[PDB]
Each structure stands twice: as structure tokens, then as C-alpha cells.
Amino acid sequence: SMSSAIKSYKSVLRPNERKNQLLKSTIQCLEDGSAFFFKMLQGLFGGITPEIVRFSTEQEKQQQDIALWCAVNWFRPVSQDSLTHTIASDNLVEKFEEYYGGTASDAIKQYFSASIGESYYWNDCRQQYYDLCRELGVEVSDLTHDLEILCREKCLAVATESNQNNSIISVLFGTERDWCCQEELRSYVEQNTIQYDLWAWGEMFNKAHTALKIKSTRNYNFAKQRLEQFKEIQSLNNLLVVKKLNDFFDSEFFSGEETYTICVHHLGGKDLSKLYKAWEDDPADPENAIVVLCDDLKNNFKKEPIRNILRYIFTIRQECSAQDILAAAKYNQQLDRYKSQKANPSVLGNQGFTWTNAVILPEKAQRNDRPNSLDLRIWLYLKLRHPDGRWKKHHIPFYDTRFFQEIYAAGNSPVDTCQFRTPRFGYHLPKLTDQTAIRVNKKHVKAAKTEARIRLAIQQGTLPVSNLKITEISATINSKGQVRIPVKFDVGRQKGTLQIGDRFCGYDQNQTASHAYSLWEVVKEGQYHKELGCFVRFISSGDIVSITENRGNQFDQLSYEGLAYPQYADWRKKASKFVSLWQITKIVTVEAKEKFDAICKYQPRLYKFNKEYAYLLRDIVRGKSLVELQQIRQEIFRFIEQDCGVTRLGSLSLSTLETVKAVKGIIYSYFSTALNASKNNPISDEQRKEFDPELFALLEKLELIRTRKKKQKVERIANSLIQTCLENNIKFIRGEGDLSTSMDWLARGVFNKIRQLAPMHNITLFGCGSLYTSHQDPLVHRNPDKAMKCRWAAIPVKDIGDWVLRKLSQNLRAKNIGTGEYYHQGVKEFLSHYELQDLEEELLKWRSDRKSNIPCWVLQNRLAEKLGNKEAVVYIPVRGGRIYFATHKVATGAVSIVFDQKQVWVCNADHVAAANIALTVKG
Amino acid sequence: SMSSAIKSYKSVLRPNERKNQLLKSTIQCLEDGSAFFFKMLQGLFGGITPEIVRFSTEQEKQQQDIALWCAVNWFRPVSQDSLTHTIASDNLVEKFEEYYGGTASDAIKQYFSASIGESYYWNDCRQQYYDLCRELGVEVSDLTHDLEILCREKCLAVATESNQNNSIISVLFGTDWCCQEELRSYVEQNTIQYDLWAWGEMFNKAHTALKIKSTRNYNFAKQRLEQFKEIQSLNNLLVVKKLNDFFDSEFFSGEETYTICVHHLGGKDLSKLYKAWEDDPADPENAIVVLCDDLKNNFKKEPIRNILRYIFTIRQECSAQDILAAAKYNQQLDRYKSQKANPSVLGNQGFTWTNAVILPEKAQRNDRPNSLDLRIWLYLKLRHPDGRWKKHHIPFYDTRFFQEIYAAGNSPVDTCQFRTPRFGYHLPKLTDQTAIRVNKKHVKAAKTEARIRLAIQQGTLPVSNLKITEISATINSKGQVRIPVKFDVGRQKGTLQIGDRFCGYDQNQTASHAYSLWEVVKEGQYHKELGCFVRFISSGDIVSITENRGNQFDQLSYEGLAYPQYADWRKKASKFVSLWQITKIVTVEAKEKFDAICKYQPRLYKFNKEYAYLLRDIVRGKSLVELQQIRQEIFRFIEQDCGVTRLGSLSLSTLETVKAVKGIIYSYFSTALNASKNNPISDEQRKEFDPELFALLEKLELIRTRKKKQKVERIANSLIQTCLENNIKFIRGEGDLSSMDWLARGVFNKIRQLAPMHNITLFGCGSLYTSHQDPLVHRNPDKAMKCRWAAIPVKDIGDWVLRKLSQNLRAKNIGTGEYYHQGVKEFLSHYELQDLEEELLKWRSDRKSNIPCWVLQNRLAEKLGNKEAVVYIPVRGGRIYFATHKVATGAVSIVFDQKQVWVCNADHVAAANIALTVKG
RNA sequence: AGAAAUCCGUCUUUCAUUGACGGAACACAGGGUAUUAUUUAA
RNA sequence: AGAAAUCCGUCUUUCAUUGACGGAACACAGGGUAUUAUUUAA
């Protein structure tokens, strides 16, 4: 029982001059000792034998390679700091064979036959072990004895058996009773570092041992993976297909400045074979199959294949092959990985040192609370090492309003109680009234406000008293004075199992990166689901939103797409001016206003406008002269910094993030154009900075904005989903991920964040594999039937344009290519419902720009005849439609209709996708 | 740990001619035996003795009166059908003292000293018992002995010890008794040859009637004795004379008078009305109005204002303690004088056949491809003329019973207890390929079959999991059958735990219900009354919605079309008012009053109520020949285009409209007949005079009753669905699980009926000032209350706002007014208008010097910049409540009078208050 | 074991032969506290 | 135990000294398918 979770806090210590020097000296002492154990432990682990690896490997599920474990511990790439006995990339195998008494394994030969860091060199750890045995004055076998004991007692970590924390110090030096070298080891360590202290030696050992063990295990896995890479590297029959794929770059399809390796995912992987199969249809519109496949790949899992290279493959499709080219792409991948990725080196690292029971308890705290301001300090009582050598405890203060608010502030409520004072845990601070009168520096106002609210709560007798029962708090401090504080708490008895009455939910991600949730209940009786093996019921549906108010107006940071067209006329007007005055880009036609009009003719919202205008500015900058670029430089600055720039406005929507990316592209295109970079002179970050420092300043700021925006978006999505769970007694959450030890940054972030957050509220998280969850029919798919449907959209017939017919034709010609078939049949249903079958053949003839194309007003007249007027609503099977025709009511607000003589629920498609993940068991 | 629930079905049996005679003969035989058993059991119970009552009453929790139990069983008022030994209304005390051997108690004497039904007479049960002992050929003590044995063995029901269900028949007849043979011969001679089931049913009917009436008479006699003690308590009857001299006085124009009970005066709180009246005379009824509002808000009946106006006339002289005691005296005297004692008559209950319905799994189905077999069969034992009992099949029809249970499911995996939306199953909707062609008088039922049939072809119909082995069926002389299905539900509790979810619900002044959903949490904000930590989940409004071509109407609160959308109806109404002219002071030719309606731009149902009142007023004075045409216009009002017989939601507005239309017809009848106080009219005269209009009276009352029933059911359904969607396990409402509104009583009793079906636990409490309590602050621990506010733009502050401010300000003394008083104070302090306070104290109804509304508007516009700003005004029945915490969904945070406040839906606050109540 | 039957009801200036839905049973003198759109703009 | 300190961040043509809010930590060739109102009426 007892689920446990950790919440942590971060700040920087603010000691005075004496204590600051004490802390820095203590931390430097701890580094110096840590590096010393690093070298000595490097020698010890160099001294291990195969038999030891046998005892440590008795219990493992997978039969382990002893020779490789011995190799990774006996030879390491290290920095100059921890290098004693150098060895060359030739002598490695020769000496290994000498040490093991057998032929060097093929996997070990790959480990040795590897690229190494520029600043890292090889080291013979066994020879280091022998020289350590002399420098200790003991016989080799005595220290081998002691090492045998330590590995047995799990005092040290061996191949797959991790150590028991820091027991080695108490076992060996604190006075597992038979040592040969104990006195020598203790004197060696004590002479080289500092006088015996259990805590200090423990921290030194921990840092050194952690670095060495993680890098050794990484090298073992790396050697096996590299051997498999090599075994596949010779697999190719002939690099003829590989040369033609690589020669893609030479041909006219690629105009890019710089070349890149062609990996399997660029081709779409396995489905490219399906693509050729769809290509067998004819070359009538290879493009439609390209687009459908790419769209499906981007929707489900992998990165969308780049279309250009696939058009070039379409050029050579008959000769080269499907299997042969795709294996050729695999060859490109494997060779580049084999050559590029170096072997992991063993270097000390920059982790901090942890003081145990370092924070004074909140009830035992000392507060200088004044009536007009509380005491916002949290004190640590650390042991520090003076120059003389004695250890004494000193008080060091730090500031953290979050830690103060959630835990550290003293609550004075007689009856009220809480674990953490934060809205996600159920507590809201009383808002500030118009009597507040905060007067402090601006650079503190936010923090001051928090204090005010807390103090107000204390004044009202409202501040709840924490019930965490904290007995000790650790604190982890680094050389920069940054402190990290973990609070570990108990949550509740563990569930894990899904009974009747239990509530679960699923969540899915849109193409526009907007999330949606679907909440279900396990019921005693009703509708049966074969995958789950129980009876399910639909509770509710909705979208994930994170809302803030600005003078009473609500903005959803996660999906706000900006001002509508008519509301940013002036900004548009300024853009118009710049586009008018300036004139076209490199075919030297189109003096810019035409494109601007095209952007404005769609009447877009503000952030889409900003993205498209950023694309237009990079295009404009592209050809222009060095003297011309000065003028444009000024306008770029107003675009990025004034009135509506991404540095001033932008929500957390996908639109805003791509706008920032496009603005970065503007600056990069500026730098390329001015520098005339090409294959002869590949401009670097350094050259951009030296050339133009301020615009590099802008580039840095933009990447910073971007990173913070992504982090904030992930945190907010997780928060919104957790609140929705908390209000609806949801006990289980399912998302697109796997919990073991191909992805989107948003999908990865949200999944790992919910993994972090759900155990705090005793909510159990599951991961699954979302394959075509956008199209599966809830309660029908895999129960037991395996049923799919297409996505629809609802549009008034007055606005059926040429693109509706283009989409209809494209969906109809795509029966063979994967997700296309559901769309093909969808069009069939459409034709069956509105009785337009006669047009089908003419729709087959609908090609890109034919004059003889059946026009849209024909369709409008037929649909108006069929529905009476031009304002009636029709449903059209289109990709990424917002309407899903569900067999059952599995979305909130879904309505019931009859389409093609079939009972149907008009549902939010995204809500259907969320339900489909909620009903998934296979990951 | 296994609670039970019952769902029942009602229908009518449709046997053929032969089986119809068999069934009617069986039922008539069963009545005849039941009536015989009634007379004989009346005699047997006439023979009980005090010692028997002791032996049955030893283990009573309370102290019981044996003499009264003996008396109520020894003398009964009966109908002529079961009357044997007539006894006169004088001789009872004498004969009772003869039979008991002691002085007849005054408590027992009151039961004898009573009014009785016109067609009911007293019965000497002792002499009937004596002669029954004769006719059996036995001695008195032998049957006293067997009666003792029967009473001891819980075979018969004596005062507090209910009988065993039907052990008597098997115990006394089924094969150290003394008389067994004589009694068996007696029953079998009079009734029919021994059958355990038939004799059991006969006995059950007779015995049940007798025991209910005996216990009821015991309670009635005790209550009457206390009423007599309190009626005779009052020394000087002068004050009551002053009340009815009120009746003679001018404050009354109604056709007929009535007894003046305590609740007409406001009860206890009337004393404070004096205390309020002592404050200041000049403006008397302001305090009166406050109390009426106060009384209507709580659980009480509104005192009629007219009587208090006269009471104020005589307040100084007639006194306060004397007036309320005198009103209690009138109440007690009329109750005592005109409530009869409960008589023992056989009754119309039906007879229950056990295991009478063929199981659904063993049923015979003549299923055709275009129509299923919608018959449910019974296999009943019936008595032929020869005397033998034989089983026959009789079919009946019930689409609800068929849909929920009886139809066979063909889904491999789906399952259900009942196929109804409240239990989680929705029938597949009909497609445009359905093609139903049947009689119109069946289309609804046909539609149900179609849906079920469609569900069957799709493999969708879930298989019931009720595990039914036997079903009873209760049949009466009219062929009406009732079928109870009893099902297993789950292990309840009264132990709210952590994670348990509860809710409360309250009812508005406009009969609009609201619900508040809370959770018991491990940590957070403590509630002293509950003894736990609570958290607020959500809040809402109870709605029951139906669609009409995609437009949603809430039956519970739809107030009808908006003004501009019903011009035509108004034109007709306007024309009729135009042509016609005023009513009795015979001024004000009707149109102007009509415009008084239209100037407020009301919605349709409010318009219909007010216009119905106006037709009533018109009808009042008019001549007999004139009424000729007014009748036809009344008819169009009630029957065409928008009359209540065609439109009307379930809102309080529509019900008041129906009440007003009935008032119209009653005023018609009075006006046409020129009935008066000494020349009264009866229903018989109304029917004979104008039969068709009495037919509309019938139809209107039927509509009223059906609408009320539907409203109660829909409110219960909506609340139960809301609970089911939110894992709510507890419900709390204003009731007690054993002074009321029919809606409050009905909703509480219906939720009591429905919640145990979903393993939901219902609690009742006492809603006192729940409209004003501050959630999580009231009784935590201090008792804090607040007034109700409303939000209005300053452009529309009128004279009535100033009136309400003045009235609330002068009402510090009278109960809830105190809170409203402070509200106005807070109001002024917030808007910095304290200077006006004194002038607001001078604001009387129609003064010329009144501070006008535009002063306030100019001042408030100054304070808030514009005339479109929103201000909060303390008004009675306001829709806004200023809560200490966020205890309503959609609540916003403001600062009022330098106090942080949540603007909450007031009704939602009341629901939260009901949810946090533990004392009833 | 006999093809008939609205089980009882509700809503809508919409009364619907595919409109949408709900139900254990018993037995006061004259009435305060709008929706689609879309038009020249802000 | 020393009166200072935005812990780190987000939103808004609103940048706020009472605006509203969120967070365990580690370590490619040129862009893809509106809201308040209230005005002559229905």
C-alpha cells in the first residue's frame, strides 16, 4: 500500500561573506574528494574479473555477456583529469586478449574499434589497477579479495546488479568483516582527501560511482548496438540503389543549401511499399497518394516523409524497387550511425552534493514576522568544513515564495487543513482587495503580491495548516549556490485494477495540437466491450483548455489564434505599406503586393497572418542586395518587436510556435543572403554573431521564448487534464505513450508530465498505441469487428467551392492507399445519400486545372434542389474534418441524424479520438 | 447487506367471453368470502379481553392504554352491509362499563361522544361476538380461549403487534385447539370448500381493513381528548367574538366565509408583528408585507393580508397573546366538531394471485416479421360453477412492461436490468424506412414496438439480468391488473466516508428547483456540523427538456412565447376588451387595465394568467343576457390557439393560469345564478344550468392533476440522472422520513421512491431560512446570514427600487428584514450614498416630496461613470447572493463594501445550504 | 395460450402513423417581487 | 539565524505595485482544409 510522490522546489542560496566562502570551500573540498574517488574507483572497477561478473549475473533474465562487461570496465575513454595509463586504438584488443585469456569478442572489437571524443583518450583500467595495488603496497590478490567482497555485498555496482546506496563507507571504513587491505584503503583515501567523515565520504563516493556505473552500462549497450549496425552494414547486395537515392541531392528536386542523410522515415518506411502498390493504380495523380500517405504518417506516429524526395523516387520507381530502395535508406541510416556516434566517455560530471536533514522544519523555524510584511526566508542548517578541518553547522537563508506558500508558511486555521496550498490541491489564496497598497521594487512585485495574499490569509485566520508530517528535508547544493529541495509525501492506498464504479478517461492530440478528453465509467451492466472484458458507459466529453482572464475577458492560451481580421486593420495597414514600397523576389516577377492580397483575401486571424507574413518577409529578403538589406533590417525589427510581434504577442497555440519558427527562418535567410553562404562558405553561428550581433541577440531571445512557451504549454495541458480528472472522480488516465524505462515534443511532454502528476493524486496512468484512433468507431472497433470510418465536415451548400470537388475527387481516387479507402467509401455514402451518383464518373475525370472540369455551381444546384435552398448544410467526407459519424453517442453535444439510411451520431471527431484512446488496451 | 426495490406495472385484463365469466365469477366469489370474513372477524375482535391486550402489549416500547384498545375493538362504526347489533349513541358508555368492569375513561368517552358518517352506524361488537359464539354452538370461554391462542401466535393483529401475513389459515385449518371444527365448518359452509389461497386472500382483505381502522380510531380518540382539553381551556371567549366581528366588517366581499386558523395570522411570529407595529403606526402593512414574504419563503402558508389589516385596527385593545390563542381556539373547535371517527368498511382492494405471470423465458410468442407479439399471459387459478379450481391463460397488454422486462433480448454481450433511459438503455431511433400503418389511437404504442423490433433485428436488445422466478398479479373487479417486480440492489450506508459524494436540493419561490453537489474530502475546509471536511463540486438547475423540430423547451420552467411573437392572440384579446366595457364604482372601461398588462411586455403564460383574471373581473358584474356572448369568448380563450387546453408548460405560471381559468368559470356561474351568502349554489346547479362549461371545469381540473403528477415525476427523474452522472451517493431535501407544498411533498416522496433503486440514500432536513444562510459559514460555528441582492443597470433604477430600499430600511425589527436592513446599509456604504439615508427614511408611498429616482441615477452614474453600469440592490427574492465562498457554479468574485464576495446564483446557494444541513 | 393493444401521462400559437420525452403501487375582490440572422458602423 | 527576495514561467494590439494564471527535479524552396450591441422588419 501507500503510494508515494515527490514534489521539489528550486532556488539559490543567499549566504553572507563568511558563510559564502565556507560553502564554496566545502563544495570545492567535496569536488576534490569526488574526483579522487573517481580515479581510484576507476582503478578498482578496472580490477574486476570474469568470475565476479558471474556471481553478479546469476539472477538475470537475459543471459549476459561477461567478456563485454569486463571490456567496458577494463578500458575506458576518459578526460585528461582522470587518465593514468594511456592505450592506443590498436593495442586495445591485443591487451584485452592478454588479460582475458581468450579471443577478443566481436562485440568487444566493435567497442574498441570506435570513434572517440575530440578531448577524450583511452585508458587501460587494469594497468591502473595494478599500479594502484603497488601504490597501496598490497598484493594484487588481496585487493581482488576485497573487491570480490564489495561486489558480493553490492557495495559496488557490477554489470546488472546495482549497489546498495552508500553502504560501502560504513562497511569498509566505518568500524563484511574479512578485509585484507582495509587499513591501506582507509589510509590512502584519508591521506589523499580529508579526515574521515561518513557523510562527506559518502557524497564523494556517490558522485564518482554513479558516473562510472552509468557510463560503463551505456558502453555495453552501445557495443552491442554497434555490432548489430555493422552486421547490417554489409547486408546490401549492391550500393547501386544507394547511389541513386543519394544522387537525389544532385538532381533538380533538391534546391537546399546543404545536404542531409536520407533515412527510412524520409521515405515513409514500410508504407512506401503500400505506396508503390497504390502507385500501381496509375500515374494519374501520384500526388494524391503522396499526400494521403504523408498526412496519415503525420497524424499517427512518425515524422511526415518529405514529399520532394518521394517525387524523385516516383521518377525512378519502376527500376530501383520498393524493398531495394528502402533497404538502401536503411543502409544510409546505419552507416551514418556507425560512423558518427562515438563511444561514451567517463568524466566526473557536474552534479551537486546532498545535505541530509538540511532544512529547518517549518514548525521549528525562526520568523521575524512584521505586521506589514511576513518573514519570507527559509533557513538551512548545513555542516561545513572550516580551513582548520572541523565540521560545524551554519544557518544559510534562501527565498522561495512557492515553497513558502505551499508548505513553509505557518497556517493558523483552527480547523482547516491541506497537504499543499496550490489550486491543483484544492486551496485558493484570498484575492487582494483595493485596500492593499503594495509599494516595493518592480522586480519584486509578483513575489510581493504572493506574500500579501498569504499574509491576508493569516490575518483572517484562514491559512490552512499543512498535514504533511515532515520530519526531515534534504537539500542538494551545487558550486553555483543553486539549491534543490524535495518533499516526499504519501498519497493513498494503491489501486491499479479497474473494478465496477471505477472511472477512467482517455486523451488525444489534434493535428493542430489541441487536446481533447473523453470520460467513461465501468458499469455493472449495459454495453460490453470485448477488449476491456467489462461493461462500459460514456460519461462525458470535452476539450482541454487553460484559461486566463484579462479585465474580465477569457483567453485560452492553449488554442487562442489571435485577433480577428477587422480588429487589426492598422497592423495590416503597416504591413501593406512595407509590401507596397518594396518589390518582388527571385523568375523575377511578383512585386510582393499580390501575395499580400492573397494572404488578406482569406481573411485570416492575427497569428496565421503573422506566420504567413513571416514567410513572405523571408521570401522577400531572399534575393535582395547587401545595401538593400539595411532597409529591410529596420522593418524586420518592427515586425518582431512592435505592437504585435511574437516577442509581444503570441499564445501557446501551434500557430504562434510556428510563427516564431518562421521568424527565426526570416533571420536565418537574412544572414544567408547578406553573407552569400553556400557550399563553399557554410556560415556558422560565430560568423552570424560577429557580422550582426543584435540580430543574433534576437535569435537567442526567440529560441528562449520558444522553449519557455513549449514548457508552459506542456505543464498547462497536464494541469487541465488533472483538474478535469479531480472534478469527475477519474481514477485512470490513458494516453499515447509507453511506461517502459516515433513521438512528438508535445506528445512526449504531456505524457511524461501526466506520468509525473497523476501519482500525486493517486491517479493511475496507462499508455497505449494510437493507430488510426482518429478513424476507429468507438464500441464497434475491435468489439469484435475492427471497424473504421472517415472524417466529415459540415458546410452550407452556398459555399461549396472548387476545393470541395477537388477533395471529393482526391478521396475517390484513393481507395487503395490505406486511410484512403474509408474516405473513398465515405464519398460513396455521400453520393448514395444525396443521390448524385451520376456525377461520380465526371468526378473521376476531375483533374487539377482542366477547363472542362465539372464546376462547383453544378453541385450547388443539385444540392439546393435536393435540400430546397442554398443555406442548407451538407456533410462532405474531407480529411481532418471536425465531424465524425459515430455508431453510438460517444461525444458531449452529439446529435442524432440519419445518413445513407443509417443511424448516426454527429460527434466531435477529436472527442471520438479521445474515446478511442480511452478504450485501448494494446500499446 | 442486500437492500430491495420494487418497480410495478398496471394494465387491464382482456380475456375472452368464457374466461371473462370465469374471472368475474372467481373475483365475486372472493369478494363474497371477503365480506363474510369481514363480519366474522369483526365479531371475533369484538371478543377480546384486557388480559389479551396486556399479553400482546408487554413488549411495547411506550406505555399503552389497554382500556382504549379494548374499546376501539369492542365498538365500531360500520356500513349497513356489515352491521349486526345496532347500538345507540347514548348506550355505549353504559355497555362499555358493563363489559370492562370499571369506570369508562374520558379518553374512551370522547371516542363514543362523536359525530359519525351519515350512512355509518355504531355496532355492538360484544353482542355480535356473543351471538357468533351462539351460532357456532360453543360456549363463550371456548372461543375466548381460541381467540387467546390466535392472538398470542401473531395470527391476529392486536394493538401494537401486527399479525403474521397469513399464518391463520394454515394454523387453524391446515392439516390443542378447542373450536377449530366449528369454525372450519362455519367458513366452509358460508364460503367455499377449503382452499388455502382463496381463504388466505379473503382473510387478508378483511383483517387488513379491520386492523387499520382500529389503530386509526385509537389515535383519533387520543388526539380528540387533547383537542377537547385545549378547547375548554380558554376562559373568556370575547376575543374570538372580535375576530368574527371582523367577519361582519367591510374588509371582506367574498361569497362565503371560513374558519380563522392560526396560520392565517402568521402563527408564533404574529407577536413580533405587534413588536413591529409598536415601533411606528403610520405605515402598517410594510411590516405585514415583510412577514408574508418571510412566511412564504419558509415552510408555511402565507397569512392573508386582509385579516392582519383588521387585526392592526384592534391591536392596541385586543392584544397579541389573546388573539393567537383565540385563533387556535377556532381551529381546535372546528376540527373537533367536524372530523368524524374512522368507520370500518370493506373497501375496494383487489386479490393477488401468486406466481401468476408466465416467465418471459417460458412465454409463447407469435412473432411475425412486421410485428412482434406484444401480449403478456397470466396462468391463473379460477373457480368454475361446479367448484373446482382450474388454471387458464389470460392475456394483457403493456408496452412499458414489454420494453423494460418482458421482451426477449438477442444481444450476445449486452445486458440490462430495465430498458429505460433512467437505467442506462436507449432504444434505437426510428429511421425514415419505418412505414407504420395502424390506427391513430395506437400509434404511440406501435412506435414503441417498432423500436423494440428494430433493436431485435440489429442484435442490439440487451438480455435482462433480473433473474425473475415468479411474479405476483393483483386483480380487481374491474379487470385492472397490477404486477410488482422486486429486484436486488446493494449495501447502503448512513456513514458518509471520504470520497463519498452528496448533494442537496431546494425549491424556488417560482417552484424552480436547484441542486448543489459536494464531496467529502480527506483534507481541506472543515464543517463543524458534518464533522468532516467538505469540498464543492458543482451546482445547477433542475431541468426536464424536450425537443420540437430541434428547438428545446424546458417543461419545468418554460414561460411561453415572448411578447412580439404572439401579436395575433393579443389582437383578438384586445378587440374583445375594446368592444366590451368596464366592470363594477363602475369606471375604467376595460382597455386601460388591458394596457396595464401589455405595458410590462409580459410573456405568454403570465399574459394568460393576467388576462384570465381580467375576464373574471369582466364576468363579475355583467347581466344574464350579456353573459350569453361572454360565454363564447371564454370558450375561444380556453380552447383555441393558445388556451391552456392546447398550450401550457409545467411551470408555476401555467398552473396558476389553470387556477385562474377555473376562477373565471366559477365567477361566471356566480354571476349568472346571482348566488350569495344566504342563497348559495351547488355543483349540481352549475351542471344543470350549463353542462358544457362544467365539462370544461372537469377537463381543466384533470389537466391540473396530470400536469402536477408529471411535474413531480420529471423533477425526480432529472435529479436522479444528475446524481447518476456525478457518482452522487447521497441526496438531501426538505422532508423527514416519517407545513408543506404539494410540490415539496411530491418531490420528496418521489425521490424516496426512486433513489433506493439506484442504491442512492435519501435524507431529509428542516429548511429554515436556507435562502439566506451563508454556506460553510452558517453554523460553522457562529450562525451567519445575509440578504438577497439583485443586479440591475443604473439606467433602469425606477421608483420601485427606491420603494424597496425604503421598505427594507424600515424593517430592522421583523425577522429577515434585519438582514435586508444591513444590506441596504452596506449598499449605501459601498456607493457612498449615506447622505440619502434620512431622505430614504422619509420615502412614503405616494408623497409629492419623494426623492425621485433620477436623483439616484445621476448620483450612481457619477459614482460609476455611465448609465449602463450594473449596481447591486438588496431586494426581496433577489437572484444574486453574496457568498463568503465560491459555492455556486459560474460565480464571480467582486469586492463589495471592502469585503471579498462571490456573486452566486441565489437558488444554488439555497441548494448548497440544504446539502450542508444535518438537523431536521 | 385467442393478433390484438395507446400501461398511465407530459411538452409545442410546431399536435408529429420516423417529433421529443417522463413514471413502483395503494388510498379569499382583484394581482411588482426572447432566439436565427445581417445592415452603414465601432 | 543576517530584512530581504520575482523559485521558474505563461497569457493580453489591455503589460497590470488589488489583471488573470501554470509547474517534482535530473540529464525547406515557398506555405498545405468574431463578441457587446441595437436599427426599419420578420
Numbering used by the authors:
A (entry chain G): 0 to 174, 267 to 677, 684 to 838, 851 to 1032
B (entry chain A): 0 to 174, 269 to 677, 684 to 837, 851 to 1032
Authors' own words:
Two Cas12i (Cas12i1 and Cas12i2) proteins have crRNA-guided dsDNA cleavage activity. In addition to the double-strand DNA (dsDNA) cleavage activity, Cas12i2 cleaves ssDNA in trans upon crRNA forming heteroduplex with the complementary ssDNA, as well as processes the pre-crRNA to form the mature crRNA. The Cas12i2 consists of the recognition (REC) and nuclease (NUC) lobes connected by the wedge (WED) domain. The RuvC domain is the sole DNase catalytic domain in Cas12i2, with catalytic residues Asp599, Glu833, and Asp1019 lining the active pocket.
